């Protein structure tokens, strides 16, 4: 459960083959919690960017798995479970995001670990295939999407994910306390991408 700087440094010491890529045509950022059975009760966070195209070769071989959106409608390299909603008939890769730059260039690297498990990348993925057209929103999304494709189900480890977002100067977005801007549902998340920041009230 708890944030461990010691786990972070020991696992991240093995990160390798850093590379800089041009700006994605679009993308979305999500947080990942890292654990290992022999470090019980410890965890730390990182960010992943999900971009168009097939780049299994940029991933550690243990992440070179392909998971599919529902029915015919596209797939993502690097994620470990199927996605219960339709995509937009595009192929994506989920890459460890080391840095996203001023000019949009992304710095990606390999990590020694399995693929991205669990349902908390679903808010991101849903926004990516339904609402994002161009660019990468400068924010980090976290949450499971219900059957209605509107309700956002909250995650454990929101503190870990926050740390991970803040490291890179980005806000955490989700439907729970601990996040920087709360979004009750997917369509409020999509409105946030449009406004870019939370609207302000002055009386």
From Swiss-Prot:
List of catalytic residues: 120 (nucleophile), 161
Effect in UniProt of substituting residue 162 to D: 60% loss of pVP2-VP4 and VP4-VP3 cleavages
Effect of mutating residue 170 to A: 60% loss of pVP2-VP4 and VP4-VP3 cleavages
Site, as annotated: Cleavage: 202-203
Domain of life where this protein originates: Viruses
Effect of residue 82 to L: No effect on polyprotein processing
Effect of residue 120 to A/Q/T: Complete loss of protease activity
Result for mutant: residue 173 to A: 20% loss of pVP2-VP4 and VP4-VP3 cleavages
UniProt domain Peptidase S50: residue ranges: 1-203
Listed name of the protein: Protease VP4
Organism in which the protein naturally occurs: Infectious pancreatic necrosis virus (strain Sp) (IPNV)
Residues of the full protein shown: 514 to 716 of 972
């Amino acid at each position: 459960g708890k944030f461990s700087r010691a786990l972070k440094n020991r696992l991240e010491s093995a990160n390798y083959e850093e590379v800089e890529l041009p700006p994605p045509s679009k993308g979305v950022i999500v947080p990942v919690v890292h654990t290992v059975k022999s470090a019980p009760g410890e965890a730390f966070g990182s960010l992943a960017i999900i971009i168009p195209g097939e780049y299994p070769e940029l991933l550690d071989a243990n992440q070179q798995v392909l998971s599919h959106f529902a029915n015919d409608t596209g797939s993502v390299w690097g994620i470990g479970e199927d996605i219960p909603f339709e995509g937009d008939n595009m192929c994506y890769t989920a890459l460890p995001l080391k840095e996203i730059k001023r000019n949009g260039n992304i710095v990606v690297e390999k990590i020694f670990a399995g693929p991205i498990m669990g349902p908390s990348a679903q808010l991101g993925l849903s926004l990516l295939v339904n609402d994002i057209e161009d660019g990468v929103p400068r924010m980090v999304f976290t949450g499971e999407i219900a059957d209605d494709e509107e309700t956002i189900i909250p995650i454990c480890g929101v503190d870990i994910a926050a740390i991970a977002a803040h490291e890179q100067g980005l806000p955490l977005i989700g439907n729970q306390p601990g996040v920087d801007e709360e979004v009750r549902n997917t369509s409020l998340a999509a409105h946030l991408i449009q406004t870019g920041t939370l609207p302000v009230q002055r009386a």
